[PDB]
Amino acid sequence: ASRDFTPPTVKILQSSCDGGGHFPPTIQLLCLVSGYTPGTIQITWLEDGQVMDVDLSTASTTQEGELASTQSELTLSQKHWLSDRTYTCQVTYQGHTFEDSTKKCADSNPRGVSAYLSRPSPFDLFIRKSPTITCLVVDLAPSKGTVQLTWSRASGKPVNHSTRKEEKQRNGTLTVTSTLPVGTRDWIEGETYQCRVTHPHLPRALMRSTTKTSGPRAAPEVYAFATPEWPGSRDKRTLACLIQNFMPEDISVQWLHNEVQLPDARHSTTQPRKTKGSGFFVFSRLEVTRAEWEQKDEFICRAVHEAASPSQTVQRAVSVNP
């Protein structure tokens, strides 16, 4: 009887706060797939879109009459819940996916507006040779008046045309991004750029400025390494790179493989920190697969930095096999 087919639905319940309104020390999320026509079912949990380890959750399926029911429970620390991460219950049933998401409920009062202004990245300055700076305005209330965002130079010389994006966010706020192309000689020779943000509902105008970092210079050292093969790493292995003793701290790190620049999401790179003596260091970690090194067994860690000579780059290769 195909007329009796009952598709699954998804809802998430959570641990309640106590009689004082306070979070418990751990949070349970309970994904409920109510009565559906019995069939093969799998539940995957996502943390900000990344698959979570199945070890962190349980799952149970019962059948009552002609209908099945499945629940999965995920447990989180209070610290992680307070970090405003979003969790997704992803249900796969007979080749069709359902899902639902949740995060900590929003606070009763809205946050004030904030603004951020970046310097150009070394990769854009020296590889692409098309540098830009970005002014980012967050926590705006939508459906108000549109926000004015104006660029100027301390020298009084003209700015180029910028591009502007406005995007409604899941939490109901608005973000505005403005990206300004800058002259390469202008930037290297110390020009100061300002982003000025105004709106009638703001208390005052917001102003941010940016300019090349002053002070001493020093070129980066680069070292690439591979972890050994062992029973836990037969068809994957971990590569690492240490980049150190450079100044100032602005740097771009990439990994290259078989004439491809790998996506930024493939690796994890730390924030620049001070060496005991002079300069900064960063570490980068890249997990690679057997199919990649069977394609070509050469992985390159590359740093882009203004003091690297002769062409603002330093790089080192590593191989995983003999």
Next chain:
Amino acid sequence: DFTPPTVKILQSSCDGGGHFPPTIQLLCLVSGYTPGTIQITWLEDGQVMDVDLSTASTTQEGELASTQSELTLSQKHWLSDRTYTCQVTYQGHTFEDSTKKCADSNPRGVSAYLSRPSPFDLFIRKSPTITCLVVDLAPSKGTVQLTWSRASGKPVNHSTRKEEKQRNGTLTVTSTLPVGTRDWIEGETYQCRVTHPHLPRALMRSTTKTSGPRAAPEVYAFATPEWPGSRDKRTLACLIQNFMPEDISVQWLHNEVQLPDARHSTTQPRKTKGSGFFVFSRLEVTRAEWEQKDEFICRAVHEAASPSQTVQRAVSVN
């Protein structure tokens, strides 16, 4: 042989933007108990709610019953900050739990954080501590009050308290509480409670040991080759990875003695691509040191390592 009832309340979640749904369900669960007479009653600010507002049902599996009751509230009532109590009467005796909407997490822009003990303090020094940090307070009058307690109500020791005004005009308050080694390992919950004169209600943070799976770290240690112009220095790098949970301590040793903490730097734990976390540790060394003895030890202390919560790896310059 007897399994008493327990009470827990679950509620409708907010969506991916943190928004409330049109109605709020509260679900009172009495799961896995020796069968007997049972009633579930809901109170709103201590008064019995109409019988038609909730439905209870009971099932049995093996030697144990389970009971649940669901109450539906309007968004407006939930947001009014009323207290809802699930009152369970089993064999004539009463068990209660209560809930209300979660209080703001960053009232007036403040943040508060509460740590777990470091593994070195817990397993090596056997003097574990936890730390409660409150940031972005106003430099107003009226001292910020910070109080410690255990979920079990057992006593706590005195704590430290430190304030200092920051360069940005804010005030941070920090307190560190010593905890019992056995008390922590057996799963006690510790609570930090902060009251400021300008805050409308008390702010609380709670911490306890992890409830997830455990996995010991892998430890790998490397020495940099000589870089042109730096004959008398080398850098040692240690990668520690795939451990769970994320709490970890890192030490370096040379000549059987532990080096001062100021000698090295360790990154904060970050997720791998799959299960577990990694950190990097960095140690600069001198020619005098490796010519004296060319062996340096990167040691990790972690609750999942056996038999003594330690895993380590040595490295040599040559």
